[PDB]
Amino acid sequence: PKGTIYLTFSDGPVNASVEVIKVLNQGGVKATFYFNAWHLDGIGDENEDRALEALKLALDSGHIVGNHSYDHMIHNCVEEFGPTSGADCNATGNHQIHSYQDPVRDAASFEQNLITLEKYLPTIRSYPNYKGYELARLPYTNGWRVTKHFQADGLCATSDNLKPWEPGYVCDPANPSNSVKASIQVQNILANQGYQTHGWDVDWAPENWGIPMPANSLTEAVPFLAYVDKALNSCSPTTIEPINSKTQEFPCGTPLHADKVIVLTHDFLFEDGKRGMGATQNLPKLAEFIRIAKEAGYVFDTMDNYTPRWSVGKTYQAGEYVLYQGVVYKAVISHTAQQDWAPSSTSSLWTNADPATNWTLNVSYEQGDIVNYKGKRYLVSVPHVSQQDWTPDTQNTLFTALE
Amino acid sequence: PKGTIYLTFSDGPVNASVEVIKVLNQGGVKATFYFNAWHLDGIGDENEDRALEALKLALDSGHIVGNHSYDHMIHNCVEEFGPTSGADCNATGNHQIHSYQDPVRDAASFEQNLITLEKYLPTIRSYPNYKGYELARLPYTNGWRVTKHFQADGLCATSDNLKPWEPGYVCDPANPSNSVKASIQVQNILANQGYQTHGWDVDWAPENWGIPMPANSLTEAVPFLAYVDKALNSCSPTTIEPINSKTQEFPCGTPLHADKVIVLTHDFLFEDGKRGMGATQNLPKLAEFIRIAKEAGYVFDTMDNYTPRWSVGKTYQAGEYVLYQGVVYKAVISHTAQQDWAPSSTSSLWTNADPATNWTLNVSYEQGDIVNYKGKRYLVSVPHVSQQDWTPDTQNTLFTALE
Ligand SMILES: CC(=O)N[C@@H]1[C@@H](O)[C@H](O[C@@H]2O[C@H](CO)[C@@H](O)[C@H](O)[C@H]2NC(C)=O)[C@@H](CO)O[C@H]1O
Ligand SMILES: CC(=O)N[C@@H]1[C@@H](O)[C@H](O[C@@H]2O[C@H](CO)[C@@H](O)[C@H](O)[C@H]2NC(C)=O)[C@@H](CO)O[C@H]1O
Ligand SMILES: [Mg+2]
Numbered sequence A, B: 001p002k003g004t005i006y007l008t009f010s011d012g013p014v015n016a017s018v019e020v021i022k023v024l025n026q027g028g029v030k031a032t033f034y035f036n037a038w039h040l041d042g043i044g045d046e047n048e049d050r051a052l053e054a055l056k057l058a059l060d061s062g063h064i065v066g067n068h069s070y071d072h073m074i075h076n077c078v079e080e081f082g083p084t085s086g087a088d089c090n091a092t093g094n095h096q097i098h099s100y101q102d103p104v105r106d107a108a109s110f111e112q113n114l115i116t117l118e119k120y121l122p123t124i125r126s127y128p129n130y131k132g133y134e135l136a137r138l139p140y141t142n143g144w145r146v147t148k149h150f151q152a153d154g155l156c157a158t159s160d161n162l163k164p165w166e167p168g169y170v171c172d173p174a175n176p177s178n179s180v181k182a183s184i185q186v187q188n189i190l191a192n193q194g195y196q197t198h199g200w201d202v203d204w205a206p207e208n209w210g211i212p213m214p215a216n217s218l219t220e221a222v223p224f225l226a227y228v229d230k231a232l233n234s235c236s237p238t239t240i241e242p243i244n245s246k247t248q249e250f251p252c253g254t255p256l257h258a259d260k261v262i263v264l265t266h267d268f269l270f271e272d273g274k275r276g277m278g279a280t281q282n283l284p285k286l287a288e289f290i291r292i293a294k295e296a297g298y299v300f301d302t303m304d305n306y307t308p309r310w311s312v313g314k315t316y317q318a319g320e321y322v323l324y325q326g327v328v329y330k331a332v333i334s335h336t337a338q339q340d341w342a343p344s345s346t347s348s349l350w351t352n353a354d355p356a357t358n359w360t361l362n363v364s365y366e367q368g369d370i371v372n373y374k375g376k377r378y379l380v381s382v383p384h385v386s387q388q389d390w391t392p393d394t395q396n397t398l399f400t401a402l403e
């Protein structure tokens, strides 16, 4: 295959999500949906009376559901969060200003999301394609927590004053805004709950979100495919425009990202309504895109496989990454996987490479790594593979407590 | 050792927790704390200004913290939950009445509990002895979700009208109250989120909870040890009094429970205040109990070890259960565990035996079993070990869809 495309749809479930799902199903592809459950509460200020129908359809159809936070951080866009806050924030268009504030509260929005999803669909955990507790994406933010060595932030994603498309807006990736600094801490809190978070390579969107009637300015399928071709193996998160969409320190050439392109789009762009003639204009683009992408030799996959699942009978090279039971691992040596050689906290063939900061077993730590253990921070003074009896509080050769 | 005692303390963290912990520390034991975070918000109507200090002290001292729900189900004791609700329910004493209503909302209380703990103590996940997301106990209810074949419910725990100790109160285990039925679904919801729940063998308590000044009538250390001795291998959950503390269908003789006694008590009983002189009277009883139990040949363990942890080097017999990373597994083959053979979703030496009802990988299913899969229920028609390819919807020879 020329490469793998991951269609990711953010900000559903809304009425428009239904026909989108239908197109994916007619196109013969699975996608990943990053949902905000406030639409199920009917307070997300969209056409959303079919929200639960959409959720069920997405899952019944075998699409992956991931966590996009309960309310898309709209609580940070308003004075007091309530039923009108979505409309209120839509009135101002201030979504990317002060987007993140209290990272603890903001991370909690991800847990609340799951409460709400599991309330409206009490059976959701019986779907293996429900990954709301393993996979996440941050509102506004091309930020990544994939592996211990594959982590990077959207350093201009959100602002403390001006919108990124306004005159006078300035960003200094070396000195990110307060909103971005909070969003980084949110990334880290989720990683410690065992989430992976992913950004994107390309965005099926208007040039910027200041553009009026956004749904009326999506790229056609062919040019969009050209854009995908361009993004393939070209470290697209660093070159992407506009500036607030970049991941400046994305690890170019990282093997996990090779031959892959993650597409971001929004369900709401596929609706005839207040953003333009999205259903009429853009549903066919999506149908055509999927068709011509396959013809070009691309395959489509979902974000639960972005990190390839560990698989018996597969030969791994030392240093290769797999996903196993929601946990990322790294091959200690080149070998062919056997049934009883699975990655674990004691496997000799694998070390844990989750993108977390809490001290964890069977991790290959490097000098300078900082870990959290029983509420204190410790510098890794000597590189080692962690194990149960080498806890940072009692192993002063391996760890030094920070001041 | 004669046996293992699991000291388990419910309803914290409160001011009284501090000196409880200290006595445990002085006695050289670890215990398990089933906490309700509403005390951290200061609305649980106890002396609880030191609630955070207590939480930190339990964790720092190495005690296990488990989930008891955010508000101990007081939202079901009042018409509108708020800051005064604890007080309001304490005025009427109606805690065991309609305690469980909407099982989905009630289960969500357990997840809200974790959000609140992680708000007041944002480093809490960096403690390995933090087991809030793995171990739980339902308010009022001697119910168990331990393994696929070790589950039983408290069929008279809560009522639809009278307090259990009132004249006129009747309970029929064969025809359980609606509150009991709701609690049974809560159990099942939690299990499908990967929780184990455990009840208790003996309760260090007043005769029943209608007893005024309940802290004043706590069994002395020596007689309490007698109660424990009697509980050892005697299926105490079936013989326990009062009626509402029973687990009527507890699997007597079940291998995981042999030589073990789980003790329930409440931090609030060790306080000098509104329930009697608990610190003065009861802390010394705790201290002495710990001392004499050790002398009698008992050891103390915590609930994260109740299902013994899989350990490299240990020999297991086919049919034995272990816990590994929060998941129960049953040995397929008698053997001596090695590094590379951790129990898992793909092990040929272990099958998953979590007490869940959702279809799950690598479970030894038996004809008659019923599983949930993508929102539908299926009857196991032929015994088999589940695997990724053998999903209920595509295996009409292994499963039969139910109406
Ligand atoms: C991945 C991501 O979060 N991208 C951002 C978009 O979600 C976002 O648009 C706004 O989303 C809100 C939540 O659904 C809507 O309430 C709001 O109406 C919508 N704004 C417009 C103009 O449609 C956009 C724009 O703020 O930014 C992306 O970064
Ligand atoms: C483990 C368990 O749930 N045990 C039950 C106790 O929680 C319960 O006592 C009551 O607990 C509430 C929650 O902390 C308190 O608000 C309430 O004041 C307290 N009752 C008294 C009289 O102190 C008891 C009795 O309701 O039943 C147990 O089964
Ligand atoms: Mg994970």
Ligand SMILES: [Mg+2]
Binding pocket: B134, B194, B195, B196, B325, B326, B327, B328
């Ligand atoms: Mg578990």
Ligand SMILES: [Zn+2]
Binding pocket: A010, A011, A068, A072, A138, A139, A140
């Ligand atoms: Zn979004």
Ligand SMILES: [Zn+2]
Binding pocket: B010, B011, B068, B072, B138, B139, B140
């Ligand atoms: Zn309780």
